[PDB]
Amino acid sequence: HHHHHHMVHITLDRNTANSWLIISKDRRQVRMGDTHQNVSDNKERFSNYPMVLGAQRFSSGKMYWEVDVTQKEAWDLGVCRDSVQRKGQFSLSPENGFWTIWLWQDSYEAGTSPQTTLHIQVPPCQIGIFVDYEAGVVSFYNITDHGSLIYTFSECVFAGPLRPFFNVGFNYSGGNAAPLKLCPL
Ligand SMILES: O=C(c1ccc2c(c1)OCO2)N1CCCCCC1
User: Which positions fall inside the B30.2/SPRY domain?
Assistant: First the structure.
């Protein structure tokens, strides 16, 4: 692709984080801790899942950023509405305000309803995310495989400001402790 010139500097918003996440001092990395990270509860925090939002809000233009997923067994990435549900159980779908892909149990899926199988020959270590607000497009790229297309959501109905969206996943296995990292420009 040729989206790199719309690069934006994303930082994580600690106030949205599940109370078990550890966000680095530079707000560019997040991982699972061993326990409750000693923060107060608030209505922004994702309660059921190890999710966090970027601080930036987007309502126009073209935006691009990259995320490192090296050695993780499970994660979700993409964008979501600023007004998504934070508490209780929910599915990642456009109907619920999410435009995401994920890894789970050695398969990659797009968060459509129902979910769509992705065809990835080279397991990605870094994912590029492109948003075109006006066109209603969210696209995912495999940076490990020369930027090859993973998935495009088109005809998106954003219906509000968008925030970068992250899920570090469960670590029931002991094999998914590695962080998500926002890669330098
Ligand atoms: O992966 C998780 C986990 C993370 C966030 C959660 C959660 C579970 O439920 C609500 O938000 N853990 C922690 C507890 C069990 C042992 C390790 C796995």
Answer: 8-185
